[PDB]
Amino acid sequence: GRYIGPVCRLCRREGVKLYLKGERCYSPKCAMERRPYPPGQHGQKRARRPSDYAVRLREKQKLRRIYGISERQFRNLFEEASKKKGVTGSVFLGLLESRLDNVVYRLGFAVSRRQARQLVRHGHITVNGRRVDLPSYRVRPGDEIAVAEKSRNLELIRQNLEAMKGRKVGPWLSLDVEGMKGKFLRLPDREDLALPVNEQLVIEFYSR
Amino acid sequence: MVKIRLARFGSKHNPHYRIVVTDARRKRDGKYIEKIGYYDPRKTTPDWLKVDVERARYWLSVGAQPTDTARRLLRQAGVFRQE
Amino acid sequence: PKKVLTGVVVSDKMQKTVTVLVERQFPHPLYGKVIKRSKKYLAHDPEEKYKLGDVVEIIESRPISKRKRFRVLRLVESGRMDLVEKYLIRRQNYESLSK
Amino acid sequence: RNLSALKRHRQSLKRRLRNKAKKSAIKTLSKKAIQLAQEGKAEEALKIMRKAESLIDKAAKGSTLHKNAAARRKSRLMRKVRQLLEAAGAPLIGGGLSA
RNA sequence: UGGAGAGUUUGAUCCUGGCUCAGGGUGAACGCUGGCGGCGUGCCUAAGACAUGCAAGUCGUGCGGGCCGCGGGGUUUUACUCCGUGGUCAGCGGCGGACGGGUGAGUAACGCGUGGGUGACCUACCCGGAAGAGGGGGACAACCCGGGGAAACUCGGGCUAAUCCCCCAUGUGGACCCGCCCCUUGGGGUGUGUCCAAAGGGCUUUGCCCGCUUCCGGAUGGGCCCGCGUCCCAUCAGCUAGUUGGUGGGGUAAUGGCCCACCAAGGCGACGACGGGUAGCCGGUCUGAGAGGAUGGCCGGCCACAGGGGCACUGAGACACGGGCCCCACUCCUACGGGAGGCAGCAGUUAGGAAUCUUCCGCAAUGGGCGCAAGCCUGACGGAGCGACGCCGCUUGGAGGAAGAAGCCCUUCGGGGUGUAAACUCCUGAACCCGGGACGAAACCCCCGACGAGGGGACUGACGGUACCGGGGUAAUAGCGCCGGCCAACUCCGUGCCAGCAGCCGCGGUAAUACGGAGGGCGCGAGCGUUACCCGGAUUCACUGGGCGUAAAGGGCGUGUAGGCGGCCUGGGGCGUCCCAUGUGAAAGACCACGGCUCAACCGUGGGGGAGCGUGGGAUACGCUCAGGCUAGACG
Ligand SMILES: [K+]
Ligand SMILES: [K+]
Ligand SMILES: [K+]
Ligand SMILES: [K+]
Ligand SMILES: [K+]
Ligand SMILES: [K+]
Ligand SMILES: [K+]
Ligand SMILES: [K+]
Ligand SMILES: [K+]
Ligand SMILES: [K+]
Ligand SMILES: [K+]
Ligand SMILES: [K+]
Ligand SMILES: [Mg+2]
Ligand SMILES: [Mg+2]
Ligand SMILES: [Mg+2]
Ligand SMILES: [Mg+2]
Ligand SMILES: [Mg+2]
Ligand SMILES: [Mg+2]
Ligand SMILES: [Mg+2]
Ligand SMILES: [Mg+2]
Ligand SMILES: [Mg+2]
Ligand SMILES: [Mg+2]
Ligand SMILES: [Mg+2]
Ligand SMILES: [Mg+2]
Ligand SMILES: [Mg+2]
Ligand SMILES: [Mg+2]
Ligand SMILES: [Mg+2]
Ligand SMILES: [Mg+2]
Ligand SMILES: [Mg+2]
Ligand SMILES: [Mg+2]
Ligand SMILES: [Mg+2]
Ligand SMILES: [Mg+2]
Ligand SMILES: [Mg+2]
Ligand SMILES: [Mg+2]
Ligand SMILES: [Mg+2]
Ligand SMILES: [Mg+2]
Ligand SMILES: [Mg+2]
Ligand SMILES: [Mg+2]
Ligand SMILES: [Mg+2]
Ligand SMILES: [Mg+2]
Ligand SMILES: [Mg+2]
Ligand SMILES: [Mg+2]
Ligand SMILES: [Mg+2]
Ligand SMILES: [Mg+2]
Ligand SMILES: [Mg+2]
Ligand SMILES: [Mg+2]
Ligand SMILES: [Mg+2]
Ligand SMILES: [Mg+2]
Ligand SMILES: [Mg+2]
Ligand SMILES: [Mg+2]
Ligand SMILES: [Mg+2]
Ligand SMILES: [Mg+2]
Ligand SMILES: [Mg+2]
Ligand SMILES: [Mg+2]
Ligand SMILES: [Mg+2]
Ligand SMILES: [Mg+2]
Ligand SMILES: [Mg+2]
Ligand SMILES: [Mg+2]
Ligand SMILES: [Mg+2]
Ligand SMILES: [Mg+2]
Ligand SMILES: [Mg+2]
Ligand SMILES: [Mg+2]
Ligand SMILES: [Mg+2]
Ligand SMILES: [Mg+2]
Ligand SMILES: [Mg+2]
Ligand SMILES: [Mg+2]
Ligand SMILES: [Mg+2]
Ligand SMILES: [Mg+2]
Ligand SMILES: [Mg+2]
Ligand SMILES: [Mg+2]
Ligand SMILES: [Mg+2]
Ligand SMILES: [Mg+2]
Ligand SMILES: [Mg+2]
Ligand SMILES: [Mg+2]
Ligand SMILES: [Mg+2]
Ligand SMILES: [Mg+2]
Ligand SMILES: [Mg+2]
Ligand SMILES: [Mg+2]
Ligand SMILES: [Mg+2]
Ligand SMILES: [Mg+2]
Ligand SMILES: [Mg+2]
Ligand SMILES: [Mg+2]
Ligand SMILES: [Mg+2]
Ligand SMILES: [Mg+2]
Ligand SMILES: [Mg+2]
Ligand SMILES: [Mg+2]
Ligand SMILES: [Mg+2]
Ligand SMILES: [Mg+2]
Ligand SMILES: [Mg+2]
Ligand SMILES: [Mg+2]
Ligand SMILES: [Mg+2]
Ligand SMILES: [Mg+2]
Ligand SMILES: [Mg+2]
Ligand SMILES: [Mg+2]
Ligand SMILES: [Mg+2]
Ligand SMILES: [Mg+2]
Ligand SMILES: [Mg+2]
Ligand SMILES: [Mg+2]
Ligand SMILES: [Mg+2]
Ligand SMILES: [Mg+2]
Ligand SMILES: [Mg+2]
Ligand SMILES: [Mg+2]
Ligand SMILES: [Mg+2]
Ligand SMILES: [Mg+2]
Ligand SMILES: [Mg+2]
Ligand SMILES: [Mg+2]
Ligand SMILES: [Mg+2]
Ligand SMILES: [Mg+2]
Ligand SMILES: [Mg+2]
Ligand SMILES: [Mg+2]
Ligand SMILES: [Mg+2]
Ligand SMILES: [Mg+2]
Ligand SMILES: [Mg+2]
Ligand SMILES: [Mg+2]
Ligand SMILES: [Mg+2]
Ligand SMILES: [Mg+2]
Ligand SMILES: [Mg+2]
Ligand SMILES: [Mg+2]
Ligand SMILES: [Mg+2]
Ligand SMILES: [Mg+2]
Ligand SMILES: [Mg+2]
Ligand SMILES: [Mg+2]
Ligand SMILES: [Mg+2]
Ligand SMILES: [Mg+2]
Ligand SMILES: [Mg+2]
Ligand SMILES: [Mg+2]
Ligand SMILES: [Zn+2]
C-alpha cells in the first residue's frame, strides 16, 4: 500500500510540518508554510477539544507517517521492542532508524524517505558490498551502506551527493562522499533524534 | 534393529539433517533414542557436519547399523579411523 | 521402590484377605486446605495373622487376584477398634439416606 | 484382481495341520501316562512320560510349541506323575524323574 | 518487566446489577475487491456411498520345473537322449506383508499423563562371547492324467527337489522333576535321572563369504501390575452372581476371577458407587498481570478403529486396513445352484454442507522392505499444481510542479474545499525480453590396500533452464469499512415514524452530522468488512479476588450423626511443612544468543530453563499423632 498519494496533506493534518518530499517542505511551497489548517471542507472551522484517544492516535499516526511504514510493520516493530529489555520508546526509535531506507535518507543519498525507498527497491544501494533491495532490512552497527558502482553515474545520486558536500551527518553515522558510502556507527539515542513525537503517547496508544 | 540414520528437520528447499539413533521400525522424523550429530548438505555454514564420535562408537559397539549416507558422514568425522 | 502404605484392618471376613483402609493428607489443588482422603486396599494375609483393628503396613506385590494387588508387610500396632468404629459408623450412615 | 500374498495364507494352513497334529499327540500321550500313574503301573507310566517329554521338546524345536510354555507342560506332567506314583509307590523304571 | 476502561435503569445522585463495546485468536466461511513471490496450510458435516489407476513386495547366492528360442554333444541318417545358454511364467522355500500410511468412530477407562514395580515376562532382524553342524529317511506343490462347475474355483490319481518335514547320534550347553546351598515371591548355583540341537549355498575353490544350531549377555521394542491426576448431571442413591475371597486346575511369553470346577459370603458406595450424558488423551495451542479459563487442527508421543458384529489360524510379534472364517446391511456377477467386493492409503467421483485441493512430477535426496551385490518395490517421502486460508517480504513510482486549471461540492456570493493532487518537466525501471545458470550429490559400487582403516575413481537432479547472476527495458492494479455517543472522522440535498439504519444507548412524523445519495473527512490497505466460535475486559462462580438488615441471598426452630475446626505446658515420633543432594522432566514449541535463505516469515546451532513425582540425608517452629501434666473453655 505505502499510502501512496498526497503527502503535504499530512504536513497539514498532523499540524506539524513533516518532510515527506524532502525539498519543497523547506521552500515556501509546502502548503504548511501557507495553509497550516487540516485538509477538507471543515479544516478552517473551530476545532473541538480532542479526546485522549484522539491525541494518542494523532501522535502515533504522526510518528508512523514520518517514516512511511505501514501499520503492520509498525505494530510488529513496536511489539518486538516491547518484548526486548529496556525502555520501549527509545528501542522503538532505534529500530525505526535502523531501517535501510531511513538510513539511506539519513546518509543524504536521497532527499526524502520515499525516494530512498525507491533507490533501495531498485538495487541502487549495497550493504557491505552485497546489493540489498529491501527497505525493511535492519542495518546493524558496523554495516557499510554504499552506492552501487553501476549507479554512481546516475544523475540523481550525482545531485544528492553533490549537495551533501559540507553537510554534517547524524552523530551515529559516517559519510564518505567521494566513495559514495557511509557507516552505521551505533544505534541513535533519543537525544540524537529531533523528531516532534512523544513516544510515551504511542506506548500508551498501544497499551489500550 | 536399532539404526543410525538421518532425520530431515529443515524447511522446504532447505534440508537440515539430524544424525540420529532410532529404531528402524519408527518413522524417520519420529521419536529417536539420541541425537548424535547434525549434517547440512548445502554447506551453508563453516560447521555443516558435527558428530559425537564417542557416542557413535558406543552405539556401533552395542549393535547399531548406519545407513550408507550415515556411515559416509561418520567416516568423514573419523568415527572408524583407527590410525 | 515398591509402594508401602499404612492402614487399618477393617474387614477380616474373607479368607486369607484383609481390607486395609489407608488415609492420606494433601493440600487442595486450588483452595490449599489440607484435605484428607482415604482408600481401601485388599491385602493378602496368607496366615490369617492379622485381625480387626490392627494397624499394619502394606506393600505393592505381584497380583494375587482381581483387586488384590498388595501384601501385609508387618504390624505397625495392635488392635485399635476406634478407627474401625469410625469406618463402621460412616458406613452405617448410608442406610439413613435412601428415600 | 488380488496380489499373490495369498501364498502366505496357503502356508499357514499347512503349518496349522503341522501344529495341531503335534499338540494332539502330546496331550494324548500325557493323559495316557497320567492314567498309568493313577493305576500304579510306574514302569509303563515313566516309560511313556519319557516319550511325552521328548515330543514336547521336539515340538518346541519349531514354532508349534515354542518357548518356555514347553517347560511349563513338562513341569506339570512330571509333577502330576510323581505325585500320583507317590499315592502308590515304587518308581520302577526310574526314567525322567530324578532320584 | 506485569494489570487502562467505556456506554446504558434517574429530572438529577450514589449503589447494586445485568446487557453491550474497544483487545487478541481461528483448519474458518460469506460480501465487495483482488498484482507478485516465499513459507505454511486446506471435509471441522455423512466413521455416508465409491467408478478408475497406483498405493507390498522381494530373493535364481535356498529348490525342482513348464512354455518359447538358440548353441554344442552320443548316432552314418532317423528315432531317442545329454550338456550349456537366453527370455518368460508361476510353483515349493525364506524374509517382509504386525512397519510405514489413514482416521476420531468407540472409550470416563490403568485409555492417557506422570512416577514406580516385574522375584510374574517376551523380543525376529542387530551386536559381543562359548560351542557345534555326523548319518539316514519322508512328503506336498510345480508338472502329468481324469472328473465336477456358468463362474469363483474345486475334487481325485500319479512323478519329484530343497535352507521343506522327520528319525538316530554328538550334550558346549539348555529344559524338567527331586534334593542341597546361597538369595529371598517364580533370583542364582549344584548333583543324579530324563529330554532337546543343526542347512545348506556362493565363489576370486580346499580358503573365504552369505548363512544354520544350542546357550549366555547386550541393545532395542513391547506385555502385564501399582500410587497420584484426568468433564457434566445426585431431577441417577443404593450397585454387584464371576459378583468378593479361597483351594485345585485350564490358559498365556508372564501375574491374574482371564476361564473352569468345588468351598466360604463376601466386594463397592455421599471421599459420589451404580446410572445417564458428553468426550480419544498428552507434549502443546489460544487467551490472561497472574491465578485461571478455553482447546487438543497442523507436527510429535501413546490409544483405539479399518462397512456393523463375532472368531480363531499363521507367526518373534496380529484377533492382522489393502490376510482368513461366520452372521447382518449394502453394491456387483449369476446358467438362480452360487459367487465377488469393502479409499477412515494417494488422487479423484458423488451425497451432505456455509465450506476444504491435482484422477500432477519423480526414485535424484532422506527413510523403509528384500537381496552378497547389481538392483527391484515404496501415492512413506521429496517436489510441483490449485485456494489472499494464514504468516512474511514487495509493487501500483521518485523529485520538481500555481496564492492554486477544469470538473465536482459548499458559500455571508467577498470566497472556501477537493490540493501538489492533476495535467505536466526531468529521473529510476514492476513487469517482461534475452544470455549464463546451480547448491541440494557422495555414498552404495569399482580399484589399491586386507572385502578392515585409509586413499583413489566413476555413475546418478523430480524440482528445472527453477533459484540466482549480467544486459536490455515500459510510469505501470486500489480497494473496503466508517464519520450521533462509546469511537478518529461534517456539510448539502432527497425523504417525512414513510423508505430505512441499529453491537449497546438509540435515530426518522419538514428544514436528520445517525435513513438514502453526493462532496469532504477518518481508518486500514491486497486487502477491507460481516457472521460464527474461544479467551479477554468479567473482581460477573471472586484460591489469588465477591457477597446475603432494606439491592438476588440466613435454613421457621431445635436436637444431633458424619465431617470441618481445637486452651495452656513438657516429651517421643517426623505424617503434613521445610531444606540439601540426586534421578526424572523425549524432540518440536516457548525464552535468549549467534548464524543460513539479499531481509523477514521460515530454518539451523548453542544456552537457560521449570512445577510435579522417585530416592538418600537433614530440620521440628507450626499443623498431626502418641504418652503425661495444668485449669482460664466446658460441665458438675
Ligand atoms: K446396604
Ligand atoms: K449518567
Ligand atoms: K492335485
Ligand atoms: K546332567
Ligand atoms: K532388557
Ligand atoms: K493457585
Ligand atoms: K494385515
Ligand atoms: K540499467
Ligand atoms: K574404503
Ligand atoms: K538491472
Ligand atoms: K419512499
Ligand atoms: K448518511
Ligand atoms: Mg521494552
Ligand atoms: Mg517488556
Ligand atoms: Mg515402533
Ligand atoms: Mg568437518
Ligand atoms: Mg572404530
Ligand atoms: Mg491410616
Ligand atoms: Mg479372615
Ligand atoms: Mg488367588
Ligand atoms: Mg505373497
Ligand atoms: Mg512370497
Ligand atoms: Mg486322542
Ligand atoms: Mg519484580
Ligand atoms: Mg527484579
Ligand atoms: Mg427506577
Ligand atoms: Mg432518561
Ligand atoms: Mg426520584
Ligand atoms: Mg472480538
Ligand atoms: Mg476480534
Ligand atoms: Mg471475484
Ligand atoms: Mg473472493
Ligand atoms: Mg504455496
Ligand atoms: Mg500441499
Ligand atoms: Mg470427518
Ligand atoms: Mg474444530
Ligand atoms: Mg542367501
Ligand atoms: Mg526356466
Ligand atoms: Mg538342439
Ligand atoms: Mg533314416
Ligand atoms: Mg519365481
Ligand atoms: Mg501406523
Ligand atoms: Mg458414562
Ligand atoms: Mg500409571
Ligand atoms: Mg483411575
Ligand atoms: Mg508409566
Ligand atoms: Mg532366526
Ligand atoms: Mg531362531
Ligand atoms: Mg551371535
Ligand atoms: Mg525322498
Ligand atoms: Mg521318494
Ligand atoms: Mg531325499
Ligand atoms: Mg496353487
Ligand atoms: Mg509324470
Ligand atoms: Mg497325491
Ligand atoms: Mg551338562
Ligand atoms: Mg537327541
Ligand atoms: Mg529346518
Ligand atoms: Mg539331515
Ligand atoms: Mg572346497
Ligand atoms: Mg462393582
Ligand atoms: Mg497357576
Ligand atoms: Mg501367543
Ligand atoms: Mg471377572
Ligand atoms: Mg487360580
Ligand atoms: Mg475415596
Ligand atoms: Mg459414571
Ligand atoms: Mg465420541
Ligand atoms: Mg503471554
Ligand atoms: Mg496457562
Ligand atoms: Mg483437556
Ligand atoms: Mg492427532
Ligand atoms: Mg497428532
Ligand atoms: Mg466407510
Ligand atoms: Mg466385517
Ligand atoms: Mg469389524
Ligand atoms: Mg517371522
Ligand atoms: Mg503361536
Ligand atoms: Mg486390531
Ligand atoms: Mg481381521
Ligand atoms: Mg483398502
Ligand atoms: Mg475371499
Ligand atoms: Mg450440495
Ligand atoms: Mg494438497
Ligand atoms: Mg511418477
Ligand atoms: Mg528412494
Ligand atoms: Mg536407499
Ligand atoms: Mg508431500
Ligand atoms: Mg502483506
Ligand atoms: Mg507527486
Ligand atoms: Mg530509460
Ligand atoms: Mg557436490
Ligand atoms: Mg542408487
Ligand atoms: Mg580384492
Ligand atoms: Mg572411500
Ligand atoms: Mg533438468
Ligand atoms: Mg536486470
Ligand atoms: Mg467523536
Ligand atoms: Mg450504516
Ligand atoms: Mg457482534
Ligand atoms: Mg423536503
Ligand atoms: Mg435534510
Ligand atoms: Mg449524514
Ligand atoms: Mg468520498
Ligand atoms: Mg478478515
Ligand atoms: Mg465475551
Ligand atoms: Mg475470572
Ligand atoms: Mg482480572
Ligand atoms: Mg454471568
Ligand atoms: Mg473468596
Ligand atoms: Mg456481589
Ligand atoms: Mg431466623
Ligand atoms: Mg469427628
Ligand atoms: Mg464430631
Ligand atoms: Mg494446639
Ligand atoms: Mg483432630
Ligand atoms: Mg516436640
Ligand atoms: Mg518428612
Ligand atoms: Mg523441551
Ligand atoms: Mg503464554
Ligand atoms: Mg541474517
Ligand atoms: Mg531445575
Ligand atoms: Mg525425604
Ligand atoms: Mg527431633
Ligand atoms: Mg491430656
Ligand atoms: Mg457453675
Ligand atoms: Zn510538506
Side-chain angles (χ1 to χ4, degrees):
Chain A
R2 286 183 50 192
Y3 167 77
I4 293 300
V7 282
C8 277
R9 93 188 307 265
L10 303 184
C11 295
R12 297 203 297 161
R13 161 64 67 176
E14 251 56 40
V16 178
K17 170 183 292 297
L18 302 185
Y19 303 97
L20 308 182
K21 292 184 175 302
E23 206 211 351
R24 197 189 198 272
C25 284
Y26 304 96
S27 303
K29 298 172 184 178
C30 176
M32 192 58 182
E33 207 85 17
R34 58 221 303 178
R35 300 169 64 182
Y37 44 86
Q41 166 189 337
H42 319 271
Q44 305 184 25
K45 298 184 178 182
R46 191 68 177 183
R48 309 177 187 90
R49 201 271 292 180
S51 59
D52 300 0
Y53 178 81
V55 179
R56 303 189 191 94
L57 183 271
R58 287 267 58 85
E59 199 76 2
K60 163 255 185 178
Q61 284 294 81
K62 181 193 305 179
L63 198 267
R64 168 200 160 195
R65 293 165 173 177
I66 280 180
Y67 290 82
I69 268 65
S70 70
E71 187 60 39
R72 201 69 178 183
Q73 309 184 31
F74 192 81
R75 179 80 184 277
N76 288 17
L77 285 176
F78 176 86
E79 293 305 285
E80 167 173 84
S82 182
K83 290 180 179 298
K84 304 174 71 64
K85 292 184 178 181
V87 178
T88 315
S90 62
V91 172
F92 192 21
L93 287 183
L95 263 43
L96 288 168
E97 213 72 19
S98 296
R99 295 182 54 91
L100 180 59
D101 52 358
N102 178 85
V103 168
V104 171
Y105 165 77
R106 288 292 188 183
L107 280 175
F109 295 155
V111 63
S112 66
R113 284 185 176 88
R114 313 207 301 184
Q115 176 176 112
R117 194 180 190 97
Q118 191 191 220
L119 288 180
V120 172
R121 250 278 85 177
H122 290 178
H124 296 310
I125 304 300
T126 138
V127 173
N128 302 312
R130 240 61 56 183
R131 174 178 60 258
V132 180
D133 55 358
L134 302 148
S136 60
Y137 179 85
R138 175 164 301 167
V139 185
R140 306 174 186 176
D143 298 341
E144 176 176 320
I145 301 94
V147 182
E149 299 77 25
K150 300 88 185 178
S151 300
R152 292 200 295 260
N153 301 271
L154 294 182
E155 183 185 325
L156 183 60
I157 298 175
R158 274 284 190 171
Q159 297 184 213
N160 293 16
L161 291 178
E162 188 62 80
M164 282 303 300
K165 288 189 175 180
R167 290 192 177 185
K168 308 301 174 59
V169 212
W172 70 99
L173 297 178
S174 82
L175 179 69
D176 184 13
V177 190
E178 295 191 8
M180 305 199 178
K181 56 183 180 180
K183 247 196 172 186
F184 188 91
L185 310 182
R186 73 174 194 276
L187 293 179
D189 310 330
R190 172 54 193 160
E191 274 49 79
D192 297 327
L193 286 324
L195 302 179
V197 175
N198 192 334
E199 55 273 347
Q200 297 305 319
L201 287 180
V202 185
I203 299 181
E204 293 178 4
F205 175 80
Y206 284 155
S207 178
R208 182 185 178 97
Chain B
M1 90 209 69
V2 53
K3 296 193 61 180
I4 299 178
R5 63 194 192 188
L6 281 67
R8 198 180 191 275
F9 272 90
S11 54
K12 181 186 297 181
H13 291 336
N14 180 21
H16 275 259
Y17 294 105
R18 291 189 179 181
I19 310 170
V20 122
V21 177
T22 186
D23 194 307
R25 293 176 291 186
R26 205 179 291 267
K27 55 176 71 65
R28 68 159 164 82
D29 289 2
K31 173 179 57 184
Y32 55 82
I33 308 175
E34 179 197 335
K35 186 193 71 175
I36 67 175
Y38 61 91
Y39 169 72
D40 181 17
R42 315 204 308 178
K43 310 101 176 180
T44 59
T45 62
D47 189 6
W48 51 276
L49 174 64
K50 198 179 77 181
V51 172
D52 201 339
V53 268
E54 42 184 35
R55 292 271 71 199
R57 292 181 186 265
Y58 168 82
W59 284 108
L60 293 179
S61 69
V62 304
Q65 296 288 351
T67 330
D68 303 2
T69 303
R71 177 178 282 102
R72 149 176 159 257
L73 299 184
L74 297 184
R75 187 174 312 276
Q76 191 173 13
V79 176
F80 309 91
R81 205 177 195 95
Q82 47 184 318
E83 310 293 336
Chain C
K2 301 185 180 183
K3 173 67 74 175
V4 177
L5 305 181
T6 300
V8 192
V9 180
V10 303
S11 177
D12 62 331
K13 309 181 185 63
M14 287 171 293
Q15 299 183 353
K16 300 176 180 178
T17 312
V18 289
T19 304
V20 190
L21 179 53
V22 172
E23 292 185 0
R24 60 187 198 101
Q25 297 182 354
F26 65 98
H28 190 280
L30 180 58
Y31 300 134
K33 175 189 186 69
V34 190
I35 60 189
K36 188 187 309 175
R37 212 97 297 184
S38 58
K39 180 169 180 174
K40 289 185 305 182
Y41 298 81
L42 293 193
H44 188 71
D45 188 5
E47 300 173 343
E48 293 289 344
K49 176 186 175 184
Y50 309 90
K51 259 61 183 300
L52 225 69
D54 294 333
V55 177
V56 303
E57 278 181 353
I58 295 304
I59 187 166
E60 184 182 285
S61 314
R62 178 235 299 165
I64 300 97
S65 68
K66 167 190 183 181
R67 201 174 176 259
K68 196 176 182 181
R69 261 81 180 192
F70 285 90
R71 287 178 304 180
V72 192
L73 219 177
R74 63 177 185 87
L75 173 64
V76 182
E77 72 167 319
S78 179
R80 46 176 312 183
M81 306 303 300
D82 49 336
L83 314 175
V84 172
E85 283 288 343
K86 183 220 303 177
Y87 165 78
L88 292 187
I89 295 172
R90 224 246 289 189
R91 164 177 282 185
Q92 187 183 4
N93 273 340
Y94 290 167
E95 299 181 356
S96 68
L97 24 77
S98 63
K99 55 208 312 167
Chain D
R1 71 274 290 100
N2 37 75
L3 99 111
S4 295
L6 317 174
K7 177 177 180 180
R8 266 294 187 177
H9 179 68
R10 319 195 212 107
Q11 302 181 340
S12 67
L13 303 182
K14 299 182 179 182
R15 292 178 175 266
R16 177 177 175 265
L17 181 58
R18 207 180 314 272
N19 297 347
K20 171 192 176 180
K22 300 180 184 297
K23 291 189 181 63
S24 293
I26 294 177
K27 305 177 181 180
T28 293
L29 287 190
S30 304
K31 309 168 188 175
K32 194 173 184 182
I34 298 179
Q35 277 287 350
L36 317 179
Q38 176 206 358
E39 313 176 51
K41 287 94 74 65
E43 188 204 72
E44 202 83 323
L46 306 183
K47 206 273 298 298
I48 292 186
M49 183 237 290
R50 292 140 131 260
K51 304 180 178 182
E53 164 185 26
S54 181
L55 281 196
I56 291 173
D57 283 329
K58 287 177 177 178
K61 294 172 56 182
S63 60
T64 295
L65 220 285
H66 230 352
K67 85 290 268 66
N68 34 32
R72 174 181 76 247
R73 300 202 172 185
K74 290 168 53 182
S75 170
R76 287 176 175 174
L77 219 205
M78 298 183 70
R79 284 179 60 258
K80 276 182 272 292
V81 170
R82 182 188 280 264
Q83 286 171 346
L84 281 185
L85 292 185
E86 274 179 88
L92 303 178
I93 223 182
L97 300 180
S98 171

